[PDB]
Design a protein around this nucleic acid. Structure first.
Ligand SMILES: O=C(CCCC[PH](c1ccccc1)(c1ccccc1)c1ccccc1)N[C@H](CO)[C@H](O)c1ccc([N+](=O)[O-])cc1
Ligand SMILES: [Mg+2]
Ligand SMILES: [Mg+2]
Ligand SMILES: [Mg+2]
Ligand SMILES: [Mg+2]
Ligand SMILES: [Mg+2]
Ligand SMILES: [Mg+2]
Ligand SMILES: [Mg+2]
Ligand SMILES: [Mg+2]
Ligand SMILES: [Mg+2]
Ligand SMILES: [Mg+2]
Ligand SMILES: [Mg+2]
Ligand SMILES: [Mg+2]
Ligand SMILES: [Mg+2]
Ligand SMILES: [Mg+2]
Ligand SMILES: [Mg+2]
Ligand SMILES: [Mg+2]
Ligand SMILES: [Mg+2]
Ligand SMILES: [Mg+2]
Ligand SMILES: [Mg+2]
Ligand SMILES: [Mg+2]
Ligand SMILES: [Mg+2]
Ligand SMILES: [Mg+2]
Ligand SMILES: [Mg+2]
Ligand SMILES: [Mg+2]
Ligand SMILES: [Mg+2]
Ligand SMILES: [Mg+2]
Ligand SMILES: [Mg+2]
Ligand SMILES: [Mg+2]
Ligand SMILES: [Mg+2]
Ligand SMILES: [Mg+2]
Ligand SMILES: [Mg+2]
Ligand SMILES: [Mg+2]
Ligand SMILES: [Mg+2]
Ligand SMILES: [Mg+2]
Ligand SMILES: [Mg+2]
Ligand SMILES: [Mg+2]
Ligand SMILES: [Mg+2]
Ligand SMILES: [Mg+2]
Ligand SMILES: [Mg+2]
Ligand SMILES: [Mg+2]
Ligand SMILES: [Mg+2]
Ligand SMILES: [Mg+2]
Ligand SMILES: [Mg+2]
Ligand SMILES: [Mg+2]
Ligand SMILES: [Mg+2]
Ligand SMILES: [Mg+2]
Ligand SMILES: [Mg+2]
Ligand SMILES: [Mg+2]
Ligand SMILES: [Mg+2]
Ligand SMILES: [Mg+2]
Ligand SMILES: [Mg+2]
Ligand SMILES: [Mg+2]
Ligand SMILES: [Mg+2]
Ligand SMILES: [Mg+2]
Ligand SMILES: [Mg+2]
Ligand SMILES: [Mg+2]
Ligand SMILES: [Mg+2]
Ligand SMILES: [Mg+2]
Ligand SMILES: [Mg+2]
Ligand SMILES: [Mg+2]
Ligand SMILES: [Mg+2]
Ligand SMILES: [Mg+2]
Ligand SMILES: [Mg+2]
Ligand SMILES: [Mg+2]
Ligand SMILES: [Mg+2]
Ligand SMILES: [Mg+2]
Ligand SMILES: [Mg+2]
Ligand SMILES: [Mg+2]
Ligand SMILES: [Mg+2]
Ligand SMILES: [Mg+2]
Ligand SMILES: [Mg+2]
Ligand SMILES: [Mg+2]
Ligand SMILES: [Mg+2]
Ligand SMILES: [Mg+2]
Ligand SMILES: [Mg+2]
Ligand SMILES: [Mg+2]
Ligand SMILES: [Mg+2]
Ligand SMILES: [Mg+2]
Ligand SMILES: [Mg+2]
Ligand SMILES: [Mg+2]
Ligand SMILES: [Mg+2]
Ligand SMILES: [Mg+2]
Ligand SMILES: [Mg+2]
Ligand SMILES: [Mg+2]
Ligand SMILES: [Mg+2]
Ligand SMILES: [Mg+2]
Ligand SMILES: [Mg+2]
Ligand SMILES: [Mg+2]
Ligand SMILES: [Mg+2]
Ligand SMILES: [Mg+2]
Ligand SMILES: [Mg+2]
Ligand SMILES: [Mg+2]
Ligand SMILES: [Mg+2]
Ligand SMILES: [Mg+2]
Ligand SMILES: [Mg+2]
Ligand SMILES: [Mg+2]
Ligand SMILES: [Mg+2]
Ligand SMILES: [Mg+2]
Ligand SMILES: [Mg+2]
Ligand SMILES: [Mg+2]
Ligand SMILES: [Mg+2]
Ligand SMILES: [Mg+2]
Ligand SMILES: [Mg+2]
Ligand SMILES: [Mg+2]
Ligand SMILES: [Mg+2]
Ligand SMILES: [Mg+2]
Ligand SMILES: [Mg+2]
Ligand SMILES: [Mg+2]
Ligand SMILES: [Mg+2]
Ligand SMILES: [Mg+2]
Ligand SMILES: [Mg+2]
Ligand SMILES: [Mg+2]
Ligand SMILES: [Mg+2]
Ligand SMILES: [Mg+2]
Ligand SMILES: [Mg+2]
Ligand SMILES: [Mg+2]
Ligand SMILES: [Mg+2]
Ligand SMILES: [Mg+2]
Ligand SMILES: [Mg+2]
Ligand SMILES: [Mg+2]
Ligand SMILES: [Mg+2]
Ligand SMILES: [Mg+2]
Ligand SMILES: [Mg+2]
Ligand SMILES: [Mg+2]
Ligand SMILES: [Mg+2]
Ligand SMILES: [Mg+2]
Ligand SMILES: [Mg+2]
Ligand SMILES: [Mg+2]
Ligand SMILES: [Mg+2]
Ligand SMILES: [Mg+2]
Ligand SMILES: [Mg+2]
Ligand SMILES: [Mg+2]
Ligand SMILES: [Mg+2]
Ligand SMILES: [Mg+2]
Ligand SMILES: [Mg+2]
Ligand SMILES: [Mg+2]
Ligand SMILES: [Mg+2]
Ligand SMILES: [Mg+2]
Ligand SMILES: [Mg+2]
Ligand SMILES: [Mg+2]
Ligand SMILES: [Mg+2]
Ligand SMILES: [Mg+2]
Ligand SMILES: [Mg+2]
Ligand SMILES: [Mg+2]
Ligand SMILES: [Mg+2]
Ligand SMILES: [Mg+2]
Ligand SMILES: [Mg+2]
Ligand SMILES: [Mg+2]
Ligand SMILES: [Mg+2]
Ligand SMILES: [Mg+2]
Ligand SMILES: [Mg+2]
Ligand SMILES: [Mg+2]
Ligand SMILES: [Mg+2]
Ligand SMILES: [Mg+2]
Ligand SMILES: [Mg+2]
Ligand SMILES: [Mg+2]
Ligand SMILES: [Mg+2]
Ligand SMILES: [Mg+2]
Ligand SMILES: [Mg+2]
Ligand SMILES: [Mg+2]
Ligand SMILES: [Mg+2]
Ligand SMILES: [Mg+2]
Ligand SMILES: [Mg+2]
Ligand SMILES: [Mg+2]
Ligand SMILES: [Mg+2]
Ligand SMILES: [Mg+2]
Ligand SMILES: [Mg+2]
Ligand SMILES: [Mg+2]
Ligand SMILES: [Mg+2]
Ligand SMILES: [Mg+2]
Ligand SMILES: [Mg+2]
Ligand SMILES: [Mg+2]
Ligand SMILES: [Mg+2]
Ligand SMILES: [Mg+2]
Ligand SMILES: [Mg+2]
Ligand SMILES: [Mg+2]
Ligand SMILES: [Mg+2]
Ligand SMILES: [Mg+2]
Ligand SMILES: [Mg+2]
Ligand SMILES: [Mg+2]
Ligand SMILES: [Mg+2]
Ligand SMILES: [Mg+2]
Ligand SMILES: [Mg+2]
Ligand SMILES: [Mg+2]
Ligand SMILES: [Mg+2]
Ligand SMILES: [Mg+2]
Ligand SMILES: [Mg+2]
Ligand SMILES: [Mg+2]
Ligand SMILES: [Mg+2]
Ligand SMILES: [Mg+2]
Ligand SMILES: [Mg+2]
Ligand SMILES: [Mg+2]
Ligand SMILES: [Mg+2]
Ligand SMILES: [Mg+2]
Ligand SMILES: [Mg+2]
Ligand SMILES: [Mg+2]
Ligand SMILES: [Mg+2]
Ligand SMILES: [Mg+2]
Ligand SMILES: [Mg+2]
Ligand SMILES: [Mg+2]
Ligand SMILES: [Mg+2]
Ligand SMILES: [Mg+2]
Ligand SMILES: [Mg+2]
Ligand SMILES: [Mg+2]
Ligand SMILES: [Mg+2]
Ligand SMILES: [Mg+2]
Ligand SMILES: [Mg+2]
Ligand SMILES: [Mg+2]
Ligand SMILES: [Mg+2]
Ligand SMILES: [Mg+2]
Ligand SMILES: [Mg+2]
Ligand SMILES: [Mg+2]
Ligand SMILES: [Mg+2]
Ligand SMILES: [Mg+2]
Ligand SMILES: [Mg+2]
Ligand SMILES: [Mg+2]
Ligand SMILES: [Mg+2]
Ligand SMILES: [Mg+2]
Ligand SMILES: [Mg+2]
Ligand SMILES: [Mg+2]
Ligand SMILES: [Mg+2]
Ligand SMILES: [Mg+2]
Ligand SMILES: [Mg+2]
Ligand SMILES: [Mg+2]
Ligand SMILES: [Mg+2]
Ligand SMILES: [Mg+2]
Ligand SMILES: [Mg+2]
Ligand SMILES: [Mg+2]
Ligand SMILES: [Mg+2]
Ligand SMILES: [Mg+2]
Ligand SMILES: [Mg+2]
Ligand SMILES: [Mg+2]
Ligand SMILES: [Mg+2]
Ligand SMILES: [Mg+2]
Ligand SMILES: [Mg+2]
Ligand SMILES: [Mg+2]
Ligand SMILES: [Mg+2]
Ligand SMILES: [Mg+2]
Ligand SMILES: [Mg+2]
Ligand SMILES: [Mg+2]
Ligand SMILES: [Mg+2]
Ligand SMILES: [Mg+2]
Ligand SMILES: [Mg+2]
Ligand SMILES: [Mg+2]
Ligand SMILES: [Mg+2]
Ligand SMILES: [Mg+2]
Ligand SMILES: [Mg+2]
Ligand SMILES: [Mg+2]
Ligand SMILES: [Mg+2]
Ligand SMILES: [Mg+2]
Ligand SMILES: [Mg+2]
Ligand SMILES: [Mg+2]
Ligand SMILES: [Mg+2]
Lengths: 48, 275
RNA sequence: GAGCUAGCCCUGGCCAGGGUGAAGCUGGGGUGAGACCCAGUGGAGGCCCGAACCGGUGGGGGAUGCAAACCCCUCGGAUGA
RNA sequence: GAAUGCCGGCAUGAGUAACGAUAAAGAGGGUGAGAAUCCCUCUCGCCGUAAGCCCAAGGGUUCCUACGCAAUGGUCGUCAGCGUAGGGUUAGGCGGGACCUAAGGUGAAGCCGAAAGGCGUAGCCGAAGGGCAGCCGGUUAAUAUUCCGGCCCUUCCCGCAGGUGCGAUGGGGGGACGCUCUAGGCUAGGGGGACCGGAGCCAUGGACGAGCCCGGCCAGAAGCGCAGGGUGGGAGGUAGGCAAAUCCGCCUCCCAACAAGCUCUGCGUGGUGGGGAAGCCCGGGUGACAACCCCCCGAAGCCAGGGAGCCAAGAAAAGCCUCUAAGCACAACCUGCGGGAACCCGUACCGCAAACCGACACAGGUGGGCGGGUGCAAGAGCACUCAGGCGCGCGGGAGAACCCUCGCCAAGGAACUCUGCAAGUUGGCCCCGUAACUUCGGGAGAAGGGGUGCUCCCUGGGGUGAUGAGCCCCGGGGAGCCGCAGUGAACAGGCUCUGGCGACUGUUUACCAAAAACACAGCUCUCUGCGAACUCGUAAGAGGAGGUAUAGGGAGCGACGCUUGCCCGGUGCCGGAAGGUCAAGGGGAGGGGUGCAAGCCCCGAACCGAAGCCCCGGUGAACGGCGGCCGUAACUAUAACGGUCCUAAGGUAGCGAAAUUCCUUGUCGGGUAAGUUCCGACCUGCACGAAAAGCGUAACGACCGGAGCGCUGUCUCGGCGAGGGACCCGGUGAAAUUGAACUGGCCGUGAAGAUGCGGCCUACCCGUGGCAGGACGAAAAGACCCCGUGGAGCUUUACUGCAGCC
RNA sequence: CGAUGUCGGCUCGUCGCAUCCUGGGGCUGAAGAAGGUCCCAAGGGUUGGGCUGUUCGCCCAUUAAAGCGGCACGCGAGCUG
RNA sequence: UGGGAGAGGGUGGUGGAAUUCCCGGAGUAGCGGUGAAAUGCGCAGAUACCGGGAGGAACGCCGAUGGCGAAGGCAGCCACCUGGUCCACCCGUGACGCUGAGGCGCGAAAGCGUGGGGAGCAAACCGGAUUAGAUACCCGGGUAGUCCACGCCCUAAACG
RNA sequence: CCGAGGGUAGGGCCCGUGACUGGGGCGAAGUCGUAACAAGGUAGCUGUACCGGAAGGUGCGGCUGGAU
């Protein structure tokens, strides 16, 4: 049957992307925390 | 009259349609239609604030002239009478000797090819607009403003009309379609006659599909819900109301007056409605 | 977190084939004029049968499965909410 | 040493289940250390509205080639979507941007919020919508509307020539629109040809033939033809289209008008460029100087912004044309022609799947287009089959029980069972025929029956032609032939009588309930006069609604028919300027602390003082409620009648052992040989009853009852047969479980149900296929039940707050 | 209670005897035939339907007879539900 | 051809008295009701009086033993549309007539459907009296209805 | 070929009968009231509507076949 993950690149960039995080205070904290933890990827990779 | 159907489906048995016979033009004026943003009942927060709305036929909004004191003295021919999806009444297309074209809601008895005008000097004939302090006491009237220059607010639905009952100072006394007796300022404009399409109220929708075509989604009784949803929710099997009949939000819905008691309008409202 | 699901908004797309034969219109009959009657025309509908498509009625299978809801037979809707 | 402990390692179950659709395989030849599995040939089978082809998502080198087989691949592997390496994606015209807007998003101005931040007209962003200029063929191992070939076209820049009041982010026109139905003419695609081209064939009894088999086209500027779409011309007046305007709008006058003309598009033809089969021969050559013609069918596509009807009344902005303003009028723009200029990203390959979403090469899920032929009434259905693609990544044997999927069955025919569950029967088309009842539509495919193939002969109308031939389409009437059987295979209702519930079509518990539940048209009550009520938000702002009482909100009821009684004492709501109670505040008789004093400070009665509550009244489609005892009539029985208690008032019409009835399988009637069910009745209704509506109701129902006809392996009562497993051999090889085990019966005992204690009995060691009685078998720290001063959801006239409102 | 699945049916049985039948007896208010009652006896047998989920029971038609109990109200790692 | 009377019908308008309700004034101890009463209304200011407004229905005197229509039935006043009937002239037509099974139309009240309207009245209903009782007569309330449009119903002591 | 009739299926009319139910007639020796005939103690009758144990009442309109 139809499952939960139905990939869509515009939906991925506009929802989790860098510019979406920078707008909101909670999004900037998500980046602050991922940068503090030393994450290699601050946001998901989307091919555009 | 209203048109019946032979009972060749279960729903055509009672379905009834407007006869659409006063209509002479089946297409809207292009410069007078703008797109109507469908809301679905949602507000600028994205939240439903009026339940069971949406999914109705697409519509263009026809611009209606609710001032008319715009063009005092300039007459206009009644060029056509049109269907309007955004209101119960029909709309009349006006051709001005100015060259300007406009829309008004069609009074009962308007004739294509008739001349109408608006002003302190206008004849007291169906379709003409005047300040209230010039329409003779007794004549029925519609498209009445509530305050000078603010636009026609009363008696705009199909078949509705208000009657002038007298004059007191700068104010005339109106009987609104509700039966309320209201002081309205004498300098508020109005259009002599009643609104047309009075057979609107005898229309039988006929089936659930017709309600849906109108943007009215199915309404659900509180009695059919659960206590998290409605005061009338829960119960084992069917249940009586077991409390004063209430709205989804708890306030009582059988008799409780809700007009604001200190509203300044009270100084101008003579008698609460009837029926 | 509405890339699953629920509702709404904007913009596109899809629904083989066959059956029934409403209003109306035309002709004829009818009458003072009508109602109305017959015929031809017409092509209506949350109309009928049935694929796609949407479903999920009953039974059987499956039950460390092909599958964390599947399979076969049967069955409901299919111009409409 | 135990924590169903944590991490890791390794056992047991076990050579066991399984190895992922029952579409299917066989042999020959190669390669190689190794072959059921790789490559090649021949035979067989499967898909063919796909299991074939193209496109968008998503995936990200999976593409091609060489060299490889440790792992990955459910076996194998010499193969591969795997390992290493090299190569491969070419655009002004295809898609996106350097264009336009939609919802939405952002947001100068502006508004709001403790902060963070929420809004917000214009503007900007935003597409699979609008707009915009490329077709056919060839080429590579791998790209091609991109390279090449042929024929076309768009924009920008500059120049030349002609022409014009030129000029815009401003004005206007246009762009610009729904659903259903549909005309004419085309094309896509298709069938036929006794005609045109072609390598060949004459088998096995016949056929050298109007024989068999193969093919008979594709693109194409200007011009022309055919079919359509779009568009009236002139003059005068003008106060409107936030300036101007010659444009547009309005008024009047005159020729024009279903015409033409002007304009645009589609199709045809078209200079020219291409392509081109079977067969044979080793993707290529040949066939071939290939032929490339006629007839028929014909779209859902095209002309298109066509036509008609209907009501629910069907985007925007730019490109474009026009109008003018500043300006500029040696410029500027328009038209033609010429030269120059033309950027960025994508392009491989998978794409109904082994490359996407599902942990897997997973029987599941995934949007758009093309989707041939014959036959069956049609069709995208069904059977076969073309092109194309496959035989599903374990095999070989065997012929047990048992399982699954399937086929048949004597006599009987529902005797099965909770129930005809299931499976039969029925089945398409044509004709004949068809009931109660009904809202006159229906019920209706009612029911029930007859016909159905092939041959010959006569013949009626239509389409295309031409009016004829031919082709194609819809019929009729005869006379015959064969079989058990003519919708000869596949696809395609069993039916009827009678109750319950819901009017109906719909909707729902994704993943145990599809219903009688929800919704539904319709009915009523109620709120709301518009800065509406109401809803979301602290607010601004929004929805309501660019709506205005024939409207919007809330509630109940639920098509329709006939109806909807009594109780306003309690609760609710509505009305009530009197009275009673009432907080802050006002007021200050009087009383107190202190200082020597003026003074300062505190307490404080009357009286004044809102809403609310008390009080008076209204109100039931508001919350709700709607009795008991005694007595009485020519026999019995009963009680129309009377009496009396209590209440706010004592259930009216209708209905009733009912989706309601405890006693209960009430009693009687009907059906049956037999009826706890079903239908019809009666009424001592435990415990119906009138919008939590009452009683009915045609039609409808994958709803739930009862009966019958038809027919059946449901059954009496079982038998045989088929394939896939089960079994055996070769290959790979799990799992829950598991204190350890050297793990028998009885009668007893034992924490009360013993392989493990006592007595007796029985018993050589170890497996394989089988059955399920035990190991209080496995699974899940019992859902029931209780307990915990454990939790959470819900309710209220529990308590105490809060918002909101007054 | 870190689980002993619960009514009825189907299938498959097995056992007790306080015996329903068939066999053998005593007494009878046993003439015969047919019964009553008690004793002995568990080898075998002990039907088919209608109603209800039913166990049970009623009823139809038969019968030599249409027995009653136990086995976790025998039996859901056997099925049914 | 000429003239007359008439509540004959249909449509649209308009006049005044009265009842009820609400607003203002003024005023206070009852009003109302009956055979007599009570329920009811009234110090929350009623009744009686004055001014204003709103709304519906019916049209006083004329009015009469009257008039008109086929009947049912028709009554303020204006107008429009329209039917029947009578008289005088004796002009035209030349038996063109009478009746009438079926048919068609009309048809008081009440009743029905859809939608308006709703002052007075008033079934049902509630209360007070009367009474042996009083599901009645009488009194206080009061919903359909009575009114308008359209469509049904088609009855009567529709009688002379 | 037709064909007595038989068979299947669906209809129409009539007759007998049926748990129970509706009113009607007659019987008279009852219980309740008194609707009508007098102004019958509320003049009566009437079509219709709603209502009440019962005769009946009331509303709306109509008739005199109404006493004074
Ligand atoms: O409780 C049970 C077992 C209940 C199992 C019903 P379940 C199931 C579970 C495992 C295996 C088979 C069946 C189920 C029940 C609850 C949760 C999950 C599964 C089920 C399945 C299908 C349909 C109905 C029930 N036995 C307890 C011993 O602990 C005890 O013997 C017992 C006590 C009281 C009664 N008594 O009659 O009162 C009967 C039996
Ligand atoms: Mg996942
Ligand atoms: Mg999707
Ligand atoms: Mg992904
Ligand atoms: Mg995307
Ligand atoms: Mg996208
Ligand atoms: Mg997206
Ligand atoms: Mg983003
Ligand atoms: Mg790094
Ligand atoms: Mg992130
Ligand atoms: Mg109708
Ligand atoms: Mg019709
Ligand atoms: Mg009609
Ligand atoms: Mg119907
Ligand atoms: Mg119409
Ligand atoms: Mg109209
Ligand atoms: Mg009209
Ligand atoms: Mg339109
Ligand atoms: Mg526009
Ligand atoms: Mg708008
Ligand atoms: Mg809007
Ligand atoms: Mg917004
Ligand atoms: Mg938001
Ligand atoms: Mg709301
Ligand atoms: Mg809504
Ligand atoms: Mg309208
Ligand atoms: Mg209308
Ligand atoms: Mg309506
Ligand atoms: Mg609508
Ligand atoms: Mg509604
Ligand atoms: Mg509802
Ligand atoms: Mg519920
Ligand atoms: Mg919630
Ligand atoms: Mg709550
Ligand atoms: Mg609540
Ligand atoms: Mg409740
Ligand atoms: Mg309840
Ligand atoms: Mg409930
Ligand atoms: Mg209940
Ligand atoms: Mg419930
Ligand atoms: Mg309920
Ligand atoms: Mg319910
Ligand atoms: Mg209730
Ligand atoms: Mg309740
Ligand atoms: Mg209650
Ligand atoms: Mg105001
Ligand atoms: Mg769209
Ligand atoms: Mg369809
Ligand atoms: Mg026809
Ligand atoms: Mg027509
Ligand atoms: Mg439908
Ligand atoms: Mg349909
Ligand atoms: Mg259908
Ligand atoms: Mg199913
Ligand atoms: Mg089945
Ligand atoms: Mg089966
Ligand atoms: Mg399936
Ligand atoms: Mg299937
Ligand atoms: Mg449907
Ligand atoms: Mg169907
Ligand atoms: Mg269809
Ligand atoms: Mg220890
Ligand atoms: Mg363990
Ligand atoms: Mg451990
Ligand atoms: Mg561990
Ligand atoms: Mg070991
Ligand atoms: Mg084993
Ligand atoms: Mg497996
Ligand atoms: Mg091999
Ligand atoms: Mg090998
Ligand atoms: Mg090969
Ligand atoms: Mg095919
Ligand atoms: Mg991947
Ligand atoms: Mg490639
Ligand atoms: Mg590669
Ligand atoms: Mg390998
Ligand atoms: Mg290997
Ligand atoms: Mg492997
Ligand atoms: Mg391997
Ligand atoms: Mg695998
Ligand atoms: Mg090798
Ligand atoms: Mg591979
Ligand atoms: Mg290479
Ligand atoms: Mg190019
Ligand atoms: Mg550029
Ligand atoms: Mg833009
Ligand atoms: Mg675009
Ligand atoms: Mg392009
Ligand atoms: Mg081209
Ligand atoms: Mg290439
Ligand atoms: Mg110009
Ligand atoms: Mg538009
Ligand atoms: Mg469009
Ligand atoms: Mg449609
Ligand atoms: Mg063809
Ligand atoms: Mg030939
Ligand atoms: Mg042509
Ligand atoms: Mg002008
Ligand atoms: Mg060639
Ligand atoms: Mg050559
Ligand atoms: Mg040649
Ligand atoms: Mg089509
Ligand atoms: Mg059109
Ligand atoms: Mg409409
Ligand atoms: Mg816009
Ligand atoms: Mg200038
Ligand atoms: Mg020019
Ligand atoms: Mg650039
Ligand atoms: Mg490419
Ligand atoms: Mg598939
Ligand atoms: Mg596809
Ligand atoms: Mg999975
Ligand atoms: Mg595989
Ligand atoms: Mg798959
Ligand atoms: Mg093709
Ligand atoms: Mg067929
Ligand atoms: Mg067919
Ligand atoms: Mg099919
Ligand atoms: Mg073929
Ligand atoms: Mg295979
Ligand atoms: Mg074997
Ligand atoms: Mg199979
Ligand atoms: Mg056989
Ligand atoms: Mg048989
Ligand atoms: Mg039978
Ligand atoms: Mg039989
Ligand atoms: Mg049954
Ligand atoms: Mg029948
Ligand atoms: Mg009929
Ligand atoms: Mg129907
Ligand atoms: Mg048939
Ligand atoms: Mg039937
Ligand atoms: Mg044959
Ligand atoms: Mg088949
Ligand atoms: Mg069939
Ligand atoms: Mg069928
Ligand atoms: Mg029936
Ligand atoms: Mg019912
Ligand atoms: Mg239901
Ligand atoms: Mg239903
Ligand atoms: Mg109904
Ligand atoms: Mg329904
Ligand atoms: Mg479910
Ligand atoms: Mg569930
Ligand atoms: Mg679940
Ligand atoms: Mg669930
Ligand atoms: Mg369900
Ligand atoms: Mg269903
Ligand atoms: Mg539901
Ligand atoms: Mg419902
Ligand atoms: Mg209703
Ligand atoms: Mg709020
Ligand atoms: Mg706002
Ligand atoms: Mg608003
Ligand atoms: Mg708005
Ligand atoms: Mg509104
Ligand atoms: Mg309903
Ligand atoms: Mg409902
Ligand atoms: Mg009826
Ligand atoms: Mg009460
Ligand atoms: Mg009360
Ligand atoms: Mg009271
Ligand atoms: Mg209460
Ligand atoms: Mg006082
Ligand atoms: Mg003092
Ligand atoms: Mg002192
Ligand atoms: Mg009630
Ligand atoms: Mg009521
Ligand atoms: Mg109470
Ligand atoms: Mg209630
Ligand atoms: Mg007695
Ligand atoms: Mg009762
Ligand atoms: Mg009563
Ligand atoms: Mg009963
Ligand atoms: Mg019974
Ligand atoms: Mg019942
Ligand atoms: Mg009950
Ligand atoms: Mg009980
Ligand atoms: Mg019972
Ligand atoms: Mg019982
Ligand atoms: Mg019994
Ligand atoms: Mg039963
Ligand atoms: Mg009884
Ligand atoms: Mg309720
Ligand atoms: Mg109920
Ligand atoms: Mg109720
Ligand atoms: Mg249904
Ligand atoms: Mg159903
Ligand atoms: Mg069998
Ligand atoms: Mg066989
Ligand atoms: Mg086999
Ligand atoms: Mg076999
Ligand atoms: Mg040991
Ligand atoms: Mg024991
Ligand atoms: Mg023991
Ligand atoms: Mg032992
Ligand atoms: Mg031991
Ligand atoms: Mg030992
Ligand atoms: Mg010992
Ligand atoms: Mg021992
Ligand atoms: Mg032994
Ligand atoms: Mg065992
Ligand atoms: Mg066991
Ligand atoms: Mg053991
Ligand atoms: Mg056990
Ligand atoms: Mg478990
Ligand atoms: Mg635990
Ligand atoms: Mg526990
Ligand atoms: Mg527990
Ligand atoms: Mg307990
Ligand atoms: Mg405690
Ligand atoms: Mg404690
Ligand atoms: Mg709690
Ligand atoms: Mg409120
Ligand atoms: Mg336990
Ligand atoms: Mg355990
Ligand atoms: Mg003897
Ligand atoms: Mg004897
Ligand atoms: Mg003895
Ligand atoms: Mg003895
Ligand atoms: Mg024995
Ligand atoms: Mg024995
Ligand atoms: Mg029993
Ligand atoms: Mg015998
Ligand atoms: Mg036992
Ligand atoms: Mg047990
Ligand atoms: Mg027991
Ligand atoms: Mg027991
Ligand atoms: Mg047991
Ligand atoms: Mg058991
Ligand atoms: Mg079980
Ligand atoms: Mg059991
Ligand atoms: Mg077992
Ligand atoms: Mg066990
Ligand atoms: Mg069972
Ligand atoms: Mg059950
Ligand atoms: Mg009024
Ligand atoms: Mg008089
Ligand atoms: Mg007279
Ligand atoms: Mg003469
Ligand atoms: Mg009448
Ligand atoms: Mg009234
Ligand atoms: Mg009494
Ligand atoms: Mg009534
Ligand atoms: Mg009524
Ligand atoms: Mg009436
Ligand atoms: Mg008379
Ligand atoms: Mg015979
Ligand atoms: Mg009397
Ligand atoms: Mg009398
Ligand atoms: Mg009584
Ligand atoms: Mg009365
Ligand atoms: Mg009369
Ligand atoms: Mg007399």
């Amino acid at each position: 049957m139809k499952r939960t993950w139905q990939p869509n690149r515009r939906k991925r960039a506009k929802t989790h992307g860098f510019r979406a995080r920078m707008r909101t205070p909670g999004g900037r904290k998500v980046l602050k925390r991922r940068r503090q933890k030393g994450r290699w990827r601050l946001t998901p990779a989307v091919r555009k | 009259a209203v048109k019946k159907f032979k009972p060749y489906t279960p729903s055509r048995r009672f379905m009834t349609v407007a006869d659409f016979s006063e209509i002479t033009k089946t297409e809207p004026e292009k410069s007078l239609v703008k797109p109507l943003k469908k809301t679905g009942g949602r507000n600028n927060q994205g939240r439903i604030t009026v339940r069971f709305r949406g999914g109705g036929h697409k519509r263009l909004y026809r611009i209606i002239d609710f001032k008319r004191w715009d063009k005092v003295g300039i007459p206009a021919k009644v060029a056509a009478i049109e269907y309007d999806p955004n209101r119960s009444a029909r709309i009349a297309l006006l051709h001005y000797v100015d060259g300007e074209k406009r829309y008004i809601i069609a009074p009962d008895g308007l004739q294509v090819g008739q001349q109408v005008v608006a002003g302190p000097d206008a004849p007291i004939q169906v379709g003409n607009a005047l300040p209230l302090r010039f329409i003779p006491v007794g004549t029925v009237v519609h498209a009445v403003e509530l305050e000078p220059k603010k636009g026609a607010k009363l008696a705009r639905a199909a078949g509705t009309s208000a009657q002038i009952q007298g004059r007191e100072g700068d104010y005339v006394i109106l009987r609104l379609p509700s039966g309320e007796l209201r002081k309205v300022h004498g300098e508020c404009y109005a259009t002599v006659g009643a609104v047309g399409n009075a057979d609107h109220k005898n229309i039988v929708l006929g089936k659930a599909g017709r309600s849906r075509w109108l943007g009215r989604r199915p309404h659900v009784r509180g009695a059919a819900m659960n206590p998290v949803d409605h005061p009338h929710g829960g119960g084992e099997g069917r249940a009586p109301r077991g409390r004063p009949p209430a709205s989804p939000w708890g306030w009582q819905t059988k008799g409780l007056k809700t007009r604001k008691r200190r509203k300044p309008s009270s100084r101008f409202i003579i008698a609460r409605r009837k029926k």
